[PDB]
């Protein structure tokens, strides 16, 4: 692809666990799309992941993608754990499913589809789209419309 899809994502909750939401912005060929939804009861980690998942799932055909997020959880999973989670059949040694397996498997399916370059950002200052996503995540959390069916403590 001569030109790559740019994605920016964030998610958060109002207290953790609590109502939560995500925001994602995609830009390709100078066309921008936004996604945002709120959940009645969820976690920060689940919303940070959901933001990336929904953005990537919106690209139905394989794309070369640059995805910018300040999520530590997403970075940790992508850079440290997900190779091994998959190899272990998505279970820990006690044979329990890994935490947030539902969302990590959806992210893994998106990683199979797309050629993603991850940009782990720090701070909103040089990152206007990420700041917009932070606001979207909050306003969604202030007006949820979905149950997070995979949130299962």
PDB file of C-alpha atoms in Angstrom:
ATOM      1  CA  UNK A   1       0.000   0.000   0.000  1.00  0.00           C
ATOM      2  CA  UNK A   2       1.413   3.323  -1.117  1.00  0.00           C
ATOM      3  CA  UNK A   3      -0.529   4.941   1.723  1.00  0.00           C
ATOM      4  CA  UNK A   4      -1.164   3.533   5.212  1.00  0.00           C
ATOM      5  CA  UNK A   5      -4.222   3.805   7.452  1.00  0.00           C
ATOM      6  CA  UNK A   6      -3.525   5.895  10.547  1.00  0.00           C
ATOM      7  CA  UNK A   7      -5.398   4.876  13.687  1.00  0.00           C
ATOM      8  CA  UNK A   8      -5.516   6.533  17.118  1.00  0.00           C
ATOM      9  CA  UNK A   9      -7.205   4.905  20.099  1.00  0.00           C
ATOM     10  CA  UNK A  10      -8.009   5.361  23.795  1.00  0.00           C
ATOM     11  CA  UNK A  11     -10.422   3.931  26.343  1.00  0.00           C
ATOM     12  CA  UNK A  12     -11.206   4.521  30.004  1.00  0.00           C
ATOM     13  CA  UNK A  13     -13.717   4.077  32.809  1.00  0.00           C
ATOM     14  CA  UNK A  14     -15.352   6.226  35.459  1.00  0.00           C
ATOM     15  CA  UNK A  15     -13.789   4.379  38.368  1.00  0.00           C
ATOM     16  CA  UNK A  16     -12.384   0.932  37.640  1.00  0.00           C
ATOM     17  CA  UNK A  17     -14.390  -1.160  37.253  1.00  0.00           C
ATOM     18  CA  UNK A  18     -17.231   1.106  36.204  1.00  0.00           C
ATOM     19  CA  UNK A  19     -19.032   2.543  33.221  1.00  0.00           C
ATOM     20  CA  UNK A  20     -16.499   2.869  30.433  1.00  0.00           C
ATOM     21  CA  UNK A  21     -15.997   3.889  26.870  1.00  0.00           C
ATOM     22  CA  UNK A  22     -13.585   4.061  23.986  1.00  0.00           C
ATOM     23  CA  UNK A  23     -12.706   6.448  21.184  1.00  0.00           C
ATOM     24  CA  UNK A  24     -10.912   5.648  17.942  1.00  0.00           C
ATOM     25  CA  UNK A  25     -10.052   7.803  14.956  1.00  0.00           C
ATOM     26  CA  UNK A  26      -9.028   6.380  11.599  1.00  0.00           C
ATOM     27  CA  UNK A  27      -7.561   8.466   8.799  1.00  0.00           C
ATOM     28  CA  UNK A  28      -6.942   7.163   5.279  1.00  0.00           C
ATOM     29  CA  UNK A  29      -6.626   9.122   2.014  1.00  0.00           C
ATOM     30  CA  UNK A  30      -7.606  12.266   3.893  1.00  0.00           C
ATOM     31  CA  UNK A  31     -10.924  10.780   5.011  1.00  0.00           C
ATOM     32  CA  UNK A  32     -11.530  10.543   8.740  1.00  0.00           C
ATOM     33  CA  UNK A  33     -13.803   8.137  10.588  1.00  0.00           C
ATOM     34  CA  UNK A  34     -14.574   8.017  14.310  1.00  0.00           C
ATOM     35  CA  UNK A  35     -15.804   5.167  16.525  1.00  0.00           C
ATOM     36  CA  UNK A  36     -16.973   5.467  20.084  1.00  0.00           C
ATOM     37  CA  UNK A  37     -19.216   3.431  22.334  1.00  0.00           C
ATOM     38  CA  UNK A  38     -19.940   3.160  26.037  1.00  0.00           C
ATOM     39  CA  UNK A  39     -20.471   0.142  28.279  1.00  0.00           C
ATOM     40  CA  UNK A  40     -22.418  -0.047  31.519  1.00  0.00           C
ATOM     41  CA  UNK A  41     -19.786  -1.952  33.469  1.00  0.00           C
ATOM     42  CA  UNK A  42     -16.247  -2.680  32.263  1.00  0.00           C
ATOM     43  CA  UNK A  43     -12.542  -1.984  32.995  1.00  0.00           C
ATOM     44  CA  UNK A  44      -9.874   0.458  31.779  1.00  0.00           C
ATOM     45  CA  UNK A  45      -7.861  -2.385  30.281  1.00  0.00           C
ATOM     46  CA  UNK A  46     -10.879  -3.766  28.420  1.00  0.00           C
ATOM     47  CA  UNK A  47     -11.745  -0.337  26.973  1.00  0.00           C
ATOM     48  CA  UNK A  48      -8.151   0.373  25.866  1.00  0.00           C
ATOM     49  CA  UNK A  49      -8.248  -2.986  24.042  1.00  0.00           C
ATOM     50  CA  UNK A  50     -11.781  -2.499  22.674  1.00  0.00           C
ATOM     51  CA  UNK A  51     -10.739   0.803  21.080  1.00  0.00           C
ATOM     52  CA  UNK A  52      -7.986  -0.904  19.037  1.00  0.00           C
ATOM     53  CA  UNK A  53     -10.177  -3.902  18.222  1.00  0.00           C
ATOM     54  CA  UNK A  54     -13.130  -1.875  16.904  1.00  0.00           C
ATOM     55  CA  UNK A  55     -10.853   0.375  14.828  1.00  0.00           C
ATOM     56  CA  UNK A  56      -9.038  -2.592  13.259  1.00  0.00           C
ATOM     57  CA  UNK A  57     -12.245  -4.611  12.745  1.00  0.00           C
ATOM     58  CA  UNK A  58     -13.618  -1.655  10.775  1.00  0.00           C
ATOM     59  CA  UNK A  59     -11.004  -2.311   8.073  1.00  0.00           C
ATOM     60  CA  UNK A  60     -12.502  -5.342   6.396  1.00  0.00           C
ATOM     61  CA  UNK A  61      -9.731  -5.798   3.872  1.00  0.00           C
ATOM     62  CA  UNK A  62      -6.059  -6.264   4.754  1.00  0.00           C
ATOM     63  CA  UNK A  63      -4.338  -2.935   5.293  1.00  0.00           C
ATOM     64  CA  UNK A  64      -0.995  -1.560   6.252  1.00  0.00           C
ATOM     65  CA  UNK A  65      -1.803   0.339   9.452  1.00  0.00           C
ATOM     66  CA  UNK A  66      -0.042   2.659  11.913  1.00  0.00           C
ATOM     67  CA  UNK A  67      -1.817   2.528  15.303  1.00  0.00           C
ATOM     68  CA  UNK A  68      -1.012   5.082  17.978  1.00  0.00           C
ATOM     69  CA  UNK A  69      -2.088   4.464  21.557  1.00  0.00           C
ATOM     70  CA  UNK A  70      -0.928   5.393  25.062  1.00  0.00           C
ATOM     71  CA  UNK A  71      -2.345   2.135  26.483  1.00  0.00           C
ATOM     72  CA  UNK A  72       0.164   0.327  28.620  1.00  0.00           C
ATOM     73  CA  UNK A  73      -1.978  -2.801  28.630  1.00  0.00           C
ATOM     74  CA  UNK A  74      -2.145  -3.014  24.826  1.00  0.00           C
ATOM     75  CA  UNK A  75       1.582  -2.357  24.570  1.00  0.00           C
ATOM     76  CA  UNK A  76       2.395  -5.008  27.147  1.00  0.00           C
ATOM     77  CA  UNK A  77       0.260  -7.605  25.472  1.00  0.00           C
ATOM     78  CA  UNK A  78       1.493  -6.870  21.954  1.00  0.00           C
ATOM     79  CA  UNK A  79       5.189  -6.516  22.846  1.00  0.00           C
ATOM     80  CA  UNK A  80       5.529  -9.081  25.673  1.00  0.00           C
ATOM     81  CA  UNK A  81       2.715 -11.655  26.075  1.00  0.00           C
ATOM     82  CA  UNK A  82       0.468 -12.356  23.131  1.00  0.00           C
ATOM     83  CA  UNK A  83       3.027 -14.671  21.252  1.00  0.00           C
ATOM     84  CA  UNK A  84       3.076 -16.875  24.348  1.00  0.00           C
ATOM     85  CA  UNK A  85      -0.592 -16.634  25.278  1.00  0.00           C
ATOM     86  CA  UNK A  86      -1.456 -18.048  21.821  1.00  0.00           C
ATOM     87  CA  UNK A  87       1.141 -20.809  22.021  1.00  0.00           C
ATOM     88  CA  UNK A  88      -0.293 -21.869  25.409  1.00  0.00           C
ATOM     89  CA  UNK A  89      -3.794 -22.152  23.930  1.00  0.00           C
ATOM     90  CA  UNK A  90      -4.857 -18.934  25.619  1.00  0.00           C
ATOM     91  CA  UNK A  91      -4.516 -20.467  29.106  1.00  0.00           C
ATOM     92  CA  UNK A  92      -2.266 -20.044  32.174  1.00  0.00           C
ATOM     93  CA  UNK A  93      -0.511 -23.029  33.823  1.00  0.00           C
ATOM     94  CA  UNK A  94      -3.564 -23.675  36.033  1.00  0.00           C
ATOM     95  CA  UNK A  95      -5.407 -24.191  32.718  1.00  0.00           C
ATOM     96  CA  UNK A  96      -7.692 -21.185  33.258  1.00  0.00           C
ATOM     97  CA  UNK A  97      -8.333 -18.959  30.234  1.00  0.00           C
ATOM     98  CA  UNK A  98      -6.088 -15.943  30.204  1.00  0.00           C
ATOM     99  CA  UNK A  99      -7.636 -12.705  31.390  1.00  0.00           C
ATOM    100  CA  UNK A 100      -9.577 -10.809  28.703  1.00  0.00           C
ATOM    101  CA  UNK A 101      -9.139 -13.703  26.303  1.00  0.00           C
ATOM    102  CA  UNK A 102     -12.285 -12.699  24.393  1.00  0.00           C
ATOM    103  CA  UNK A 103     -10.777  -9.357  23.413  1.00  0.00           C
ATOM    104  CA  UNK A 104      -7.208 -10.557  22.944  1.00  0.00           C
ATOM    105  CA  UNK A 105      -8.389 -13.261  20.491  1.00  0.00           C
ATOM    106  CA  UNK A 106     -10.249 -10.561  18.494  1.00  0.00           C
ATOM    107  CA  UNK A 107      -7.111  -8.420  18.498  1.00  0.00           C
ATOM    108  CA  UNK A 108      -5.061 -11.426  17.355  1.00  0.00           C
ATOM    109  CA  UNK A 109      -7.512 -11.997  14.462  1.00  0.00           C
ATOM    110  CA  UNK A 110      -6.965  -8.346  13.442  1.00  0.00           C
ATOM    111  CA  UNK A 111      -3.195  -8.790  13.662  1.00  0.00           C
ATOM    112  CA  UNK A 112      -3.510 -11.718  11.255  1.00  0.00           C
ATOM    113  CA  UNK A 113      -5.472  -9.561   8.841  1.00  0.00           C
ATOM    114  CA  UNK A 114      -3.519  -6.306   8.975  1.00  0.00           C
ATOM    115  CA  UNK A 115       0.149  -5.339   8.844  1.00  0.00           C
ATOM    116  CA  UNK A 116       0.237  -3.143  11.898  1.00  0.00           C
ATOM    117  CA  UNK A 117       2.953  -0.804  12.996  1.00  0.00           C
ATOM    118  CA  UNK A 118       2.347   0.131  16.609  1.00  0.00           C
ATOM    119  CA  UNK A 119       3.335   3.577  17.893  1.00  0.00           C
ATOM    120  CA  UNK A 120       3.345   3.680  21.710  1.00  0.00           C
ATOM    121  CA  UNK A 121       2.742   7.273  22.554  1.00  0.00           C
ATOM    122  CA  UNK A 122       3.414   9.239  25.706  1.00  0.00           C
ATOM    123  CA  UNK A 123       1.280  12.281  26.471  1.00  0.00           C
ATOM    124  CA  UNK A 124      -1.413  14.231  24.655  1.00  0.00           C
ATOM    125  CA  UNK A 125       0.713  17.304  23.852  1.00  0.00           C
ATOM    126  CA  UNK A 126       1.945  16.269  20.404  1.00  0.00           C
ATOM    127  CA  UNK A 127      -1.056  14.005  19.855  1.00  0.00           C
ATOM    128  CA  UNK A 128      -4.324  15.819  19.062  1.00  0.00           C
ATOM    129  CA  UNK A 129      -6.124  12.723  17.759  1.00  0.00           C
ATOM    130  CA  UNK A 130      -5.306  10.813  20.943  1.00  0.00           C
ATOM    131  CA  UNK A 131      -6.645  13.712  23.007  1.00  0.00           C
ATOM    132  CA  UNK A 132      -9.859  13.604  20.928  1.00  0.00           C
ATOM    133  CA  UNK A 133     -10.069   9.873  21.679  1.00  0.00           C
ATOM    134  CA  UNK A 134      -9.690  10.490  25.405  1.00  0.00           C
ATOM    135  CA  UNK A 135     -12.679  12.831  25.246  1.00  0.00           C
ATOM    136  CA  UNK A 136     -14.740  10.347  23.173  1.00  0.00           C
ATOM    137  CA  UNK A 137     -13.969   7.570  25.697  1.00  0.00           C
ATOM    138  CA  UNK A 138     -15.229   9.781  28.574  1.00  0.00           C
ATOM    139  CA  UNK A 139     -18.362  11.047  26.838  1.00  0.00           C
ATOM    140  CA  UNK A 140     -19.240   7.470  25.875  1.00  0.00           C
ATOM    141  CA  UNK A 141     -18.692   6.349  29.481  1.00  0.00           C
ATOM    142  CA  UNK A 142     -21.067   9.182  30.530  1.00  0.00           C
ATOM    143  CA  UNK A 143     -23.793   7.741  28.248  1.00  0.00           C
ATOM    144  CA  UNK A 144     -23.335   3.975  27.820  1.00  0.00           C
ATOM    145  CA  UNK A 145     -25.456   1.939  25.464  1.00  0.00           C
ATOM    146  CA  UNK A 146     -23.840  -1.538  25.584  1.00  0.00           C
ATOM    147  CA  UNK A 147     -23.281  -4.383  27.968  1.00  0.00           C
ATOM    148  CA  UNK A 148     -19.680  -5.638  27.981  1.00  0.00           C
ATOM    149  CA  UNK A 149     -20.693  -9.287  27.662  1.00  0.00           C
ATOM    150  CA  UNK A 150     -17.136 -10.511  28.173  1.00  0.00           C
ATOM    151  CA  UNK A 151     -16.515  -8.698  31.465  1.00  0.00           C
ATOM    152  CA  UNK A 152     -16.632 -11.683  33.790  1.00  0.00           C
ATOM    153  CA  UNK A 153     -15.217 -11.362  37.270  1.00  0.00           C
TER     154      UNK A 153
END
